[PDB]
Amino acid sequence: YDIQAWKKQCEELLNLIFQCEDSEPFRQPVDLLEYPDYRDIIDTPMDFATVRETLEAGNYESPMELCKDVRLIFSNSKAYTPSKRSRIYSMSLRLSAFFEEHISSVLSDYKSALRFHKR
Ligand SMILES: COCc1nnc(N)s1
């Protein structure tokens, strides 16, 4: 029932994601010199270094907010991909499966801890 435990659990999951070769396209903001129309399609760029910096600055209040930003990394790639003949989109799908598999207990434990706090 530790209400704060999610933060270190998310730091560890982010470390696992950076170790994954599938995170390579998502470890830093998309370069607009490489993808000049990126902001014409993507309203809110997001990447794993930005998520980690937001977490470390103490600017997430819950793992649900972190999860929303991570899910935006994947939805941005889906929106920006022209077809399945994309190593980057295929990496996003595997990485998303890995993230969802690991974030589920973080979210459940946090929500359980908050319910216990207001029992
Ligand atoms: C992550 O770099 C920008 C891109 N996003 N989806 C692509 N298929 S290329």
Curated annotation (Swiss-Prot):
Stretches assigned to the Bromo domain: 1-106
Modified residues (Phosphothreonine): 44
Domain of life: Eukaryota
Organs and tissues of expression: Expressed in myeloma and epidermoid carcinoma cell lines.
Localization (cell): Nucleus
PTM sites of type Phosphoserine: 90
Subunit structure of this chain's protein: Interacts with IRS1 and IRS2. Interacts (via bromo domain) with acetylated lysine residues on histone H1.4, histone H3 and H4 (in vitro).
Function in brief: Probable regulator of the insulin and insulin-like growth factor signaling pathways. Stimulates cell proliferation through regulation of cyclin transcription and has an anti-apoptotic activity through AKT1 phosphorylation and activation. Plays a role in the regulation of cell morphology and cytoskeletal organization.
Disease as annotated in the protein's UniProt record: Chung-Jansen syndrome: An autosomal dominant disorder characterized by developmental delay, intellectual disability, autistic features, anxiety, hypotonia, obesity, and dysmorphic features.
Protein name: PH-interacting protein
Covered residues, full protein: 1316 to 1434 of 1821
